[PDB]
C-alpha cells in the first residue's frame, strides 16, 4: 500500500513550500489557541488538504492524529443523514486536551470536509445548523474547489485561504525530485508532457507517474505510455478529424468516427480535446461559437447517457457544416 | 462570547417586524383562545421559530414551557416511527397544569414524506382540543394538500430593506462598529431579506476586520464583485474568442469564482443591459440551458465556452443590427 499522493504529503508545515504566508498564519492561529474560523480553497493538486493535515500533525501530534481529526468526503456523503450522524458521533466524544508528552494541546477536534462545494444549498444549510449545534467542542475546516460555491453562512464562520496554482517550473522540479527519489527514469520532455496532460494538478501527475512506473516496470518512460495512461487522444486523430470535416463528405466522417470508436477512444476525451483545439485556432467567431455550443450539448448528452457514436457523428456533421461551407 | 442572533433574539410580539398583520391575527386568536394548528412557511431566517416561541412564552410561563411544549427539529429524523412515537404520545395525554392545550413545534416540516404527512394528518385530526400543532417549513408545495387543508397556514415573507435597516441601525448603535452607506447596501443586498444572515455577516465582519464597508463584506463573504462581472461581460461582448476564454479562465482560477455564480450574476446583469428582445430571448434560453448542463455534472470549460459562444453570437447580432 504505497499511495504516492499520500506518501509525499509534507507532514511538517515548514516542509510546505510556496505557501509560507498561509503556513505562518496557520502557525499563528495554532499558537493563539482560539481558532473559530478556517477554510481552504483552490484548484486540485495545490496541497490544501496536505497543508491542513500538516497543521494538524504539528499541533495534535501523531498520538492525537487518530483521535481528534476526522476527514469526510462531501461528494461521497452527499446524503443529509450520514453527515448528521457521523459528525455528531465524533463530536459527542469528550476527549480532554491533556497530552502524555506534556505538550499543551488546546481543546478542540478538527473536521475536514473534502470537496465541500459539491453540496447543494439545503445540504449546506443543514450543515451550518450542525455547525451551530457543535460550535464549542469541535472545530471545522472545509475544503472546496471554488469558494463562491459555498453558501454565505459557512463563509461567516470561516476565514478564507486562497491557493495559487503552482507554476510549471516547480511542478517539473517536484516531479524530477520524486523520480530521483524513487529511481524513475524519465526525461525532461516526459515530465513536461506529464504536466501538460495533467493541467495544473499534482495529484493527477503523481498518480500518472505512479501508473507509468507500474506499466513500464523499470523501463524508460516514453511519450506513448504518458499519452495512453491519461487516455489522451493523439493530435494526429484530431488533425484527421478536422481534415475530414474541412474537405470531405459524410463517408469520410463515418470512416474517422468508426475509426475513433473502434480504437476505443472515449467521447469525453474527444469533446475536451476538440474544444481545446477549436478554442485556440484561427476560425471565425461564429464558427467557433456554433462548434463550442455543439460540443457543450454533446457532453451534456454523454453525461445523460446517450450513445456516443450518434453524438460523435452529429458533432462531426456540425463541424463539417461550419468548416466546409 | 455569544453570537448576536442568540443575544438579540426577539422576545415580544412588537419586537418582530414586517409580520404585523400575521402577529395581529395571532394575538387576536390567542386572546380569544381560538388558536388553530399553525403552519408557518417561508424563506429561512425570516422569523418563524422566534414568533412561535414568543407566542409560547406569552401563553405559558417559564416553569411550564418545558412541560407543555415539545420541540422536534432537524436532529430528529422525520419518517413514520416518529409520528407513531413521541409526538403521538405527547399529543394524546393530559397535563396536571392549567386547563390549556399543548404545543408541538416541528421544525422543518417540509422534509416529511407523503405517508408521514398523512399519518400526521391522522394525529392532528384525532386530537384537536388538547393539542395545537405548529409545523414550520420552507416550501409549502412539499406537503400534501390534506395537511394544508387541516392546519391554518401563514406566509412569513422576506423583510424589505426599507423596514430592515432600522434594526441594523439599532444593532450598530448598540454595538459600536464602523458603519458606512456602502456597507449597509452590501448587507441588505447580500443578506437577501433575512435578518439571520445579516446579523451573522455583520458579526463576522466585526470580528474579522473591525470595520464594515462594502469591500470588507465582499472579501469576508466571497460574493462576486460587480466590477468583476462587468469585466466578464465586457470580455464576452468586445473581445476575441480565445482572448475572452483565456481572460475568463484566468479570472476563474485567480478570484475563486465558479461558473454557477458567474451564470447567476450575469443573469442579473443582462436584464440591466438594454438588449433587443430577440437576442435577450436567445441569451436567456442559452444561459438556462448552461445552468441545467452544469446541474447534471459535466466539464466546466466547455460550458464556459458555450457561455462565451452565446455572447459572441450576441455581439455579432448586436453589431450587425447597428
Amino acid at each position: 500500500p504505497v499511495p504516492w499522493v499520500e506518501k509525499y504529503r509534507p507532514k511538517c508545515v515548514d516542509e510546505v513550500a510556496f505557501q509560507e504566508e498561509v503556513v505562518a498564519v496557520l502557525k499563528k492561529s495554532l499558537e493563539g489557541a482560539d481558532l473559530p474560523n478556517l477554510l481552504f480553497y483552490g484548484p486540485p493538486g495545490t496541497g490544501k488538504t496536505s497543508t491542513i493535515l500538516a497543521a494538524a500533525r504539528e499541533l495534535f501530534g501523531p498520538e492525537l492524529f487518530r483521535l481528534r481529526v476526522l476527514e469526510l468526503n462531501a461528494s461521497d456523503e452527499r446524503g443529509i443523514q450520514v453527515v448528521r450522524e457521523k459528525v455528531k458521533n465524533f463530536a459527542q466524544l469528550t476527549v480532554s486536551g491533556s497530552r502524555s508528552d506534556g505538550k499543551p494541546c488546546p481543546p478542540f477536534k478538527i473536521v475536514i470536509l473534502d470537496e465541500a462545494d459539491s453540496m447543494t444549498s439545503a445540504a449546506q444549510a443543514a450543515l451550518r445548523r450542525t455547525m451551530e449545534k457543535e460550535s464549542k467542542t469541535t472545530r471545522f475546516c472545509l475544503i472546496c474547489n471554488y469558494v463562491s460555491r459555498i453558501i454565505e453562512p459557512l463563509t461567516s464562520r470561516c476565514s478564507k485561504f486562497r491557493f495559487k496554482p503552482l507554476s510549471d517550473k516547480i511542478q517539473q522540479q517536484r516531479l524530477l525530485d520524486i523520480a530521483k527519489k524513487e529511481n524513475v527514469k524519465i526525461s525532461d520532455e516526459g515530465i513536461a508532457y506529464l504536466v501538460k496532460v495533467s493541467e495544473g494538478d499534482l495529484r493527477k501527475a503523481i498518480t500518472f507517474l505512479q501508473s507509468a512506473t507500474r506499466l513500464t516496470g523499470g523501463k524508460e518512460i516514453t511519450e506513448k505510455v504518458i499519452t495512453d495512461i491519461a487516455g489522451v487522444i493523439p493530435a494526429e486523430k484530431i488533425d484527421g478529424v478536422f481534415a475530414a470535416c474541412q474537405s470531405g463528405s459524410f463517408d469520410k466522417l463515418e470512416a474517422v468516427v468508426k475509426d475513433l470508436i473502434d480504437e476505443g477512444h472515449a467521447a469525453t476525451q474527444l469533446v475536451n480535446q476538440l474544444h481545446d483545439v477549436v478554442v485556440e485556432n484561427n476560425l471565425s467567431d461564429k464558427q467557433k461559437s456554433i462548434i463550442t455550443e455543439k460540443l457543450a450539448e454533446v457532453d451534456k448528452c454523454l453525461a445523460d447517457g446517450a450513445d456516443e457514436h450518434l453524438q460523435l457523428i452529429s458533432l462531426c456533421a456540425t463541424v463539417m457544416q461550419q468548416l466546409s461551407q | 462570547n455569544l453570537p448576536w442572533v442568540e443575544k438579540y433574539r426577539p422576545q415580544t410580539l412588537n419586537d418582530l417586524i414586517s409580520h404585523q398583520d400575521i402577529l395581529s391575527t395571532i394575538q387576536k386568536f390567542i386572546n380569544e383562545d381560538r388558536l388553530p394548528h399553525l403552519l408557518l412557511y417561508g424563506p429561512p431566517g425570516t422569523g418563524k421559530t422566534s414568533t412561535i416561541l414568543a407566542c409560547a412564552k406569552q401563553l405559558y410561563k417559564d416553569k411550564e414551557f418545558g412541560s407543555m411544549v415539545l420541540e422536534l427539529n432537524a436532529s430528529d429524523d422525520r419518517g413514520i416511527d416518529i409520528i407513531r412515537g413521541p409526538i403521538l404520545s405527547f399529543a394524546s395525554t393530559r397535563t396536571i397544569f392549567k386547563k390549556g392545550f399543548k404545543l408541538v413545534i416541528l421544525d422543518e416540516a417540509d422534509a416529511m414524506t407523503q405517508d408521514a404527512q398523512n399519518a400526521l394528518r391522522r394525529v392532528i385530526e384525532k386530537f384537536t382540543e388538547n393539542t395545537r400543532f405548529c409545523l414550520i417549513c420552507n416550501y409549502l408545495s412539499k406537503i400534501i394538500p390534506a395537511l394544508q387543508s387541516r392546519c391554518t397556514r401563514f406566509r412569513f415573507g422576506p423583510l424589505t430593506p426599507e423596514l430592515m435597516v432600522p434594526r441594523l441601525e439599532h444593532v450598530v448603535e448598540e454595538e459600536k462598529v464602523d458603519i458606512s452607506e456602502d456597507g449597509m447596501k452590501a448587507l441588505v443586498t447580500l443578506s437577501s431579506g433575512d435578518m439571520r444572515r445579516a446579523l451573522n455577516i455583520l458579526q463576522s465582519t466585526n470580528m474579522a476586520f473591525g470595520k464594515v464597508t462594502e469591500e470588507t463584506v465582499y472579501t469576508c463573504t466571497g460574493h462576486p464583485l460587480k466590477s468583476d462581472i462587468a469585466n466578464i461581460l465586457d470580455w464576452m461582448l468586445n473581445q476575441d474568442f480565445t482572448t475572452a476564454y483565456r481572460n475568463i479562465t484566468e479570472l476563474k482560477t485567480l478570484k475563486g469564482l465558479a461558473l454557477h455564480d458567474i451564470l447567476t450574476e450575469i443573469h442579473l446583469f443582462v436584464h440591466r443591459v438594454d438588449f433587443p428582445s430577440s437576442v435577450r430571448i436567445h441569451l436567456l434560453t442559452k444561459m438556462a440551458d448552461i445552468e441545467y448542463r452544469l446541474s447534471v455534472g459535466t466539464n466546466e470549460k466547455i460550458q464556459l465556452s458555450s457561455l462565451i459562444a452565446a455572447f459572441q453570437v450576441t455581439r455579432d447580432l448586436i453589431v450587425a443590427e447597428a
Binding site: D285 | L233, N238, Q239, V273, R315, I318, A322
Partner: peptide
C-alpha cells in the same frame, strides 16, 4: 433603438464590438 453607436453621456454603458470592430454600446439603465 436598443443599440446605439454613439455613447450615452447621461447613463452607464457597456461596449460591444465584432470581428471588424465597429464599437457599438449598450445602455445599462
Amino acid at each position: 433603438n436598443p443599440v446605439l453607436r454613439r455613447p450615452p453621456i447621461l447613463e452607464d454603458y457597456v461596449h460591444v464590438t465584432s470581428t471588424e470592430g465597429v464599437r457599438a454600446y449598450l445602455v445599462l439603465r
